[PDB]
Each structure stands twice: as C-alpha cells, then as structure tokens.
Amino acid sequence: LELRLKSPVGAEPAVYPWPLPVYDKHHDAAHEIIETIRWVCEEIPDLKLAMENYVLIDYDTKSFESMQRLCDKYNRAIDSIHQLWKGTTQPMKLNTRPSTGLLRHILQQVYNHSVTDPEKLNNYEPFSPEVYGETSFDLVAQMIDEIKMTDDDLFVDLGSGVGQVVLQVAAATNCKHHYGVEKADIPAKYAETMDREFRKWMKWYGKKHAEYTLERGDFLSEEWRERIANTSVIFVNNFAFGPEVDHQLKERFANMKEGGRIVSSKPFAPLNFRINSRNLSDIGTIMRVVELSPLKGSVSWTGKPVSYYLHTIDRTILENYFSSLKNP
C-alpha cells in the first residue's frame, strides 16, 4: 500500500508508504504531501487553476482513501498539464531557482527524509566545539539578501552540520562553488543523505541549484589553511567554538584577500576596535566588523534578539594607521 505524487517535470514520482510516517511533533508525511501539492501549484498556474475544482478540504490526514483521492486529483491534473505542454502552451522554465517560499518547503522535506533520528544530533560532548545548533532558515535568508554574491565568489560553511545552510545558499545564489565541512560523524553522516535527497527533490520540482560539496573534515587542518585563504565568503556559527578555536580561525582569516567576508554568530574582533600601538597584531587591524540587523521578533535563549556579524577584510584600515604615523 502507498501514495504517489508525480513530478511536474517527469522525474520519478515520489512514493509514500502507508500509514504515513511522523517526523516530529509538528511535522508528518501527510502534511508534507499536502504542502508539496500546494507548492507545485505555485510553480504552475494552470495546475493551481485545476486544483481549485471541488477540493473543498474533504480530506483528512487519517484516511488512506481520502489522501489517495487528493494525490490522484493532483496526479490527473499533472497529466493534463503535461499534455498541455505537448500542445502550444509553453513548458515551465527548467533552469530557474526556487522562490524563497518553495525553498523553505524543500529544505523542510529534505531534512525530514534525511535526519531520521533528530535526537542523535544532541549526542555531542557538551561544553565543546562539537556543540550542535542550527541557524534558522530566515537568518540564512537574511545573509543571502544582505551579503550579495556572484559567480566570482566561493562560499564555505565551516562546521556545516547536516549541511542545510550550504544547501539553502547553493539554491539561492550563483557562486562558483559552495562547500560545507563538518567534523562530527553523526551530522556528517546525515549530510550524505541530505545531499542525495536535496539533489533528488530539486530535480523533482525542476529547480536549479549552484555547485556545492558537503565534506567530512576538520577545518583546522593543514589542507584547510589554504582553502580558507581562497574563500571569499565564509559562514561560521562559532557561538560555542570557544577562545582557542576562534583564535585559530583568526590566524587563518588573516590570509584572506581584500573584500573577503565572514559572517558569524560571535564576532572575531571588537566592534569598537581602535587601532593603536598595542594592538598591531590584532585581526581587527585588517577588517571591518558590523552587526547585522536583527530580524523583527527573534528572541534567542539570552532573551535578546539573535545576532550575527559581518566581517570584511579591509587592509586599508592598517595602511592608514601607518600613514597617520608618518605625520602629524
């Protein structure tokens, strides 16, 4: 026994066994199905136009028949749309990026099909750099909107977890490459499935994504010293990293090129940094730091609004200090 949803672009249908599984207290396969149909409707006007017909909510996530009736109405509409494209009508553009709303849904779907046992992610040594925590879709969305990127950029998420930040960025921008490196076995293992599921579902919806790679590794290693040096945009959720690891990261950001940028949950240099005779060796001498605007309604455990910081490699700061010394 099952449930099938045909792809709007001919990819292999999505098959859900019955009974539909539950992902967590607020997410189950039944709702995923309904939302997926809703979103494909957003991709295809004619499809949405056909789904209005009679579907007066007469479906209940409990009954197989009731769900099978929903899927079938969706599937029959997809067949007609497919015939419609054989006619004169223009077939949906295949190399487009997903809208933000579809992307949120897609990542939710990929996650649920990938992180089967969410609890396992918390099995980490507390009070260590291994502490797990996920950056909200919204913040990543904010970063993407504020930190403009181009096909010239190289994006890296240091300590990528199951890799959902990399996936969102790869789906939203056109960097030459996106990388995620994660050290712990658990999140890294899940990342392999996140990766497969993601590519599979993007194909299913007919949406394009930039190049990306999810890697198992240690970003403090020798290999990464240079890779970091060549990265133009680094995202790093270092809230629980600690002074030791942050110090080491600073030692590595010191080799980045001008205009290179770093977005993190904990600043690598004071915001009020004033270069003087005692702090010449400080990383703050070669970078501008600013606090990104907080997203309205966003309370972290600290009770205050969640905060992220943008650092921009700017050696002009240092150059001017020395000039100021040739005077005054």
Footprint of ligand SAM on this chain (CB under 6 A)?
A: 129-130, 132-135, 157, 159-161, 165, 181-184, 187, 218-220, 237
> Whole-number minimum distance, CB 128 to ligand SAM, in Å?
8
> Whole-number minimum distance, CB 182 to ligand SAM, in Å?
5
135 annotated ligand binder: yes
Our CB check for ligand SAM shows the closer of 132 and 321 to be 132
In DSSP terms, 162 is beta-bridged to: none
218 annotated ligand binder: yes
Beta-strand ranges (E) seen in 127-255 are 154-158, 177-182, 212-216, 233-236
Start-to-end CA distance of the chain, whole Å, equals 83
Q: Is residue 135 within 8 Å of 163, Cβ to Cβ?
A: no
CA distances from 100 to 39, 47, 106, 122, 284 (A): 11, 20, 10, 28, 35
Our CB check for ligand SAM shows the closer of 81 and 166 to be 166
Our CB check for ligand SAM shows the closer of 170 and 181 to be 181
Our CB check for ligand SAM shows the closer of 125 and 152 to be 125
Our CB check for ligand SAM shows the closer of 59 and 235 to be 235
219 annotated ligand binder: yes
127 annotated ligand binder: no
Q: Is residue 262 within 8 Å of 184, Cβ to Cβ?
A: no
42 annotated ligand binder: no
242 annotated ligand binder: no
> Whole-number minimum distance, CB 168 to ligand SAM, in Å?
10
Cα distance between residue 258 and residue 14, in whole Å: 46
Sheet of 287-291, strand order: 212-216, 177-182, 154-158, 233-236, 261-264, 309-313, 287-291
Which residues does the annotation place in the binding site?
132-135, 155-164, 182, 218-219
Which residues does the annotation place in the binding site for S-adenosyl-L-methionine?
132-135, 155-164, 182, 218-219
